[PDB]
């Protein structure tokens, strides 16, 4: 695709949809995911109840409640099975396919939060980048970080990718 790394509150992201690290149970929990449920409303989590449960590595889509976005894409990285880079690579790949299917234009990823979870951050970020760059250019993606520092670190990675890809 085409990604832009920034520091912000994804619940403030104006666009079509936001993407968040999830557990295949689709049960919204800690950190920013909670902000989502907080800003969005009971609609989000309840949509998940109805949807049911999925497979780690896959993603599911719900409304965004009050959020400025139309949808919330839930990439499953842990749950019935332990999380891992391939669990991230896959989950991330599905999240994108979801948006494509929905024919979306703008989508933001929560950055490295519930995406790491014990794994090497520098690694997660990279496998996550690569997948995003494989996504259709009809997609304008934004990597939103809580902290400006990580925002640069992503920019540093994003640059390393563009370098060895001529
Ligand atoms: Cl695995
Ligand atoms: Na979380
Ligand atoms: Na909304």
């Amino acid at each position: 695709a085409r990604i832009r790394e920034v520091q912000g509150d994804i619940t403030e992201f104006q666009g079509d949809a936001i993407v968040n690290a999830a557990n295949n149970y689709l049960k919204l929990g800690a950190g920013v995911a909670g902000a989502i449920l907080r800003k969005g409303g009971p609609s989000i989590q309840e949509e998940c109840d109805r949807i049911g449960k999925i497979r780690v590595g896959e993603a599911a889509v719900t409304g965004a409640g009050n959020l400025p976005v139309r949808y919330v894409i839930h990439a499953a990285v842990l749950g019935d099975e332990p999380a891992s880079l391939e669990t991230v690579r896959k989950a991330t790949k599905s999240a994108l396919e979801k948006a494509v299917e929905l024919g979306l234009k703008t989508v933001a990823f929560t950055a490295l939060g519930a995406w790491v979870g014990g794994l090497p951050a520098e690694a997660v970020l990279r496998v996550m980048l690569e997948e995003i760059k494989k996504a259709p250019d009809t997609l304008e993606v934004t990597g939103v970080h809580g902290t400006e520092k990580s925002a640069e670190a992503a920019r540093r990675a994003l640059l390393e990718h563009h370098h060895h890809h001529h």
Side-chain angles (χ1 to χ4, degrees), residues 64-67 69:
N66 298 302
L67 288 178
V69 305

Side-chain angles (χ1 to χ4, degrees), residues 9 46 66 70 102 109 114 119-121 127 130 132 136 143 145 159:
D9 177 33
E46 301 189 4
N66 298 302
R70 182 61 187 68
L102 295 177
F109 283 70
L119 300 164
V127 319
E130 279 147 45
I132 299 175
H145 307 213
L159 277 179

Side-chain angles (χ1 to χ4, degrees), residues 6-8 111 144-153 155:
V6 313
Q7 182 287 298
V144 183
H145 307 213
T147 278
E148 169 61 48
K149 193 223 163 306
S150 78
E152 304 179 309
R155 291 181 199 131

Side-chain angles (χ1 to χ4, degrees), residues 4 6 13 30 34 36 41 52 91 102 106 128 130 158:
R4 124 208 321 292
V6 313
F13 179 72
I36 290 170
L102 295 177
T106 69
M128 281 190 79
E130 279 147 45
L158 195 45

Side-chain angles (χ1 to χ4, degrees), residues 81-87 90:
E81 319 157 38
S84 66
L85 263 23
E86 193 56 25
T87 263
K90 285 186 175 178

Side-chain angles (χ1 to χ4, degrees), residues 71-82:
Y71 302 123
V72 179
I73 308 179
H74 318 261
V77 296
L78 72 160
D80 292 318
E81 319 157 38

